[PDB]
């Protein structure tokens, strides 16, 4: 039974409710859209 088992590391100790608060504060999101330029804003003709 034993001579066939697999070596495993002992389970880890889960994160605390205080540590998570820090990680949620260091994280920073990128801007929603890339910054605009001047070649990026040409208007098309308006016809009748």
């Amino acid at each position: 039974i034993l001579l066939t088992r697999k070596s495993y590391k002992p389970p880890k100790r889960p994160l605390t409710e205080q540590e998570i608060d820090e990680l949620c504060d260091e994280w920073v999101p990128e801007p929603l859209i890339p910054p605009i330029t001047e070649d990026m804003k040409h208007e098309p003709p308006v016809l009748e």
Binding site: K12, R13, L15, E19, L23, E26
Partner: protein, 470 residues
């Protein structure tokens, strides 16, 4: 990494188990006799078991007091017990043995006629040392002239010199790295390096001694897994290696280590304690012997105790690293400056080595330190001993493997007027007990010839010729 005869790996464990068994038995009859001022004991019962049950049995192979300069020949004082071997006391009788356990490689720990006259003159003009630190009143002129000789010698732009070679590693590593960093050290690193890493908050891993294919596999995992619990990025990575790994006698594989540290953008911390006056055609260390550009390593630590015959340490690097350390290193701010006659004797030794003393005996030392080591090491291998290290190293440990051969190989040699050094279990791994032989440039050929026949005759009795002779 060490070839061990199988039949000797078995009579060593048996020898240690017998000591363990008799020690536990004897300590069990002391705990029941203590029946015959309220504070807790200075030391528990069982934290110094191998200090009182293994070290006290052979305590006469250590701490031998000498009464002469650390030269090729010195005088060893004799000690008796007088109370059944509990407290050794020194007599007036002396001996005259062959020095093979010191460290003066270039033969500077003596009275030579270019350095001692200058140091004595720099004494009676400066009185030992200043009582202030270096940022207040302890920066004499000699302290400013010496930090130029070291920069010229080592090769890097700037250098700082301290007053202890052990504080040069515990008071600096905290500055460069902190919490969130990583330190992939080598297995066989000095105690100062590990204590310095502990004094900060950094994490320490260990890669296999002197093999880079294992250094790569550790960096890959550690950069692919981040911090151990909250998988942030590693803020830094520093790799610490040594020039010559003493007590193994091997030169490091520096070109194959720097190349892998560049790839993963890790830093390199060199440690030229044993290899700063010994190896190299000019004495510039491993970075000259192995032909590696000195600007690929970020920090280079050294020590003047072994080659230059004077206490101290140094760190060399980019001109902003030195400016940062001179402003935020506790050892530089709070500690008394290195004494003045102990700095003049480094200046006047680097002048001899570089050949700026007028004479030319700065190359005779560098050649005779090599033609002696290559002879001694070659002769020991031909007789069948097991000696480690390469061909270009002043140290050559001889393996013994048996705890009982440590007091047998040393007591005989001392009786035949040869002094050596032996290292036991609590300091080393269990299976690897050895003797360390240090060869200097002040030994003559007549001395090595005479000392080899004393060793060859002692090695028959103990039977430490594990390899076959011819």
């Amino acid at each position: 990494m060490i070839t061990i005869p199988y039949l000797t790996a078995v009579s060593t464990y048996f020898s240690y188990g017998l000591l363990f068994a008799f020690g536990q038995l004897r300590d069990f009859f002391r705990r029941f006799i203590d029946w015959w001022q309220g504070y807790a004991p200075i030391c528990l019962g069982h934290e110094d078991f191998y200090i009182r049950r293994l070290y006290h049995r052979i305590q006469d192979c250590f701490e031998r007091p000498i009464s002469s300069a650390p030269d090729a020949w010195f005088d060893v004082v004799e000690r008796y017990s007088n109370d059944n071997n509990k407290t050794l006391k020194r007599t007036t009788k002396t001996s005259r043995c062959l020095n093979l356990g010191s460290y003066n490689y270039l033969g500077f720990g003596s009275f030579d006629e270019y350095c001692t006259p200058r140091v004595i003159e720099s004494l009676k003009k400066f009185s030992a040392s200043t009582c202030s630190s270096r940022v207040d009143a302890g920066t004499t002129s000699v302290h400013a002239e010496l930090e130029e000789c070291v920069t010229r010698f080592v090769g890097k732009p700037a250098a700082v010199v301290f007053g202890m070679g052990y504080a040069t590693n515990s008071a600096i590593i905290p500055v460069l790295i902190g919490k969130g960093g990583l330190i992939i050290s080598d297995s066989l690193n000095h105690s100062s390096i590990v204590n310095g890493a502990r004094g900060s908050g950094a994490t320490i891993r260990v890669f296999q001694h002197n093999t880079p294919s294992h250094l790569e596999r550790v960096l890959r995992e550690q950069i692919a897994e981040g911090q151990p619990r909250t998988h942030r990025p590693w803020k830094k990575i520093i790799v610490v290696v040594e020039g010559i790994y003493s007590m193994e006698g091997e030169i490091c594989h520096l070109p194959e280590v720097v190349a892998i540290c560049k790839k993963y953008k890790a830093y390199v911390y060199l440690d030229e304690a044993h290899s700063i006056g010994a190896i190299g055609k000019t004495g510039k260390g491993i970075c000259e012997l192995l032909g590696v550009d000195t600007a690929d390593v970020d920090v280079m630590m050294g020590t003047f105790t072994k080659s230059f015959g004077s206490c101290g340490g140094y760190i060399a690097g980019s001109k902003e690293l030195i400016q940062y350390l001179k402003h935020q290193c506790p050892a530089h701010l709070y500690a008394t400056s290195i004494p003045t006659p102990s700095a003049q004797q480094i200046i006047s030794a680097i002048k001899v080595i570089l050949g700026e003393d007028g004479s030319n005996r700065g190359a005779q030392k560098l050649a005779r330190i090599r033609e002696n080591s290559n002879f001694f090491r070659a002769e020991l291998q031909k007789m069948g001993f097991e000696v480690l290290g390469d061909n270009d190293s002043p140290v050559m440990p001889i393996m013994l493997y048996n705890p009982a051969k440590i007091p047998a190989f040393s007591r005989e040699c001392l009786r035949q007027k040869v002094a050596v050094v032996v290292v036991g279990f609590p300091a080393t791994p269990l299976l690897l007990a050895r003797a360390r032989i240090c060869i200097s440039a002040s030994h003559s050929r007549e001395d090595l010839i005479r000392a080899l026949k004393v060793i060859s005759k002692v090695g028959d009795l103990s039977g430490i010729k594990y390899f076959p002779a011819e």
